[PDB]
Amino acid sequence: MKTMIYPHQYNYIRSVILRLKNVYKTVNDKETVKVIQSETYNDINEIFGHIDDDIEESLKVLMNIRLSNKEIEAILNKFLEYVVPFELPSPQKLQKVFKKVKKIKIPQFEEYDLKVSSFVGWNELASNRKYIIYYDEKKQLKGLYGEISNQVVKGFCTICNKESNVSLFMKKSKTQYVKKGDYICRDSIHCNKQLTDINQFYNFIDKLD
C-alpha cells in the first residue's frame, strides 16, 4: 500500500530531483548544497507524508552527491508507482459536459501521458479549438473549449509557467458575448508534463471567467 500522490506532485518531484542533480554538478559552496539537499529532502518528505522503505532509500541515494543519471531514472520509475493517474471520463459523461457539441470524442491517450496529467487538452483543426477537461477541487468533471490561434510563439505558458511553444487561447463567455484568455502551450501533453503546481492551472481557469 503506497501512499497516493497527484501527477503534478510527481512532476514537481522530478523537477527538484533534476535541479538537485544540477546543483551537485555545478555548485561548489558546501553549505548551499546542504541547504538544498535538506530542502529537497523536505519537499519530497512533505509530498509523500510518510517515508516507506523505498522512499527512504531513494532519498538516501538522492542525498549522495555522487548521484548518477541511472539512479535518477530508477528513482523516477519508482516514484511513478505512487501516482494516481488522471481518470478519463466515459463518453456519455464527456458528452454531457459538452452538451452542445455533437460529435465529440476524446482522442486516444497513453496511460503514461495520463500519469503526468492534471488536465486533458486536445486540438481540433476545422474548429480551431482546444478542448480542456479536468476535475475541479471537488473532483467533479469539468470541460471547456476555446479558440487557439495558429501562430506559435516562444514564451512562458500561462498554465505551466514554462518557456514553451505557446499560442493565444481565447474562451467565449456565455452569450453578444465576451472573449477572455492568454497564451498556453499548443501541445497540452507536454504542458501537463511541465506542470508542477496545479494552482496555476486553476488560476488560469479562473481568469477565463
Ligand SMILES: [Zn+2]
Ligand atoms: Zn504549458
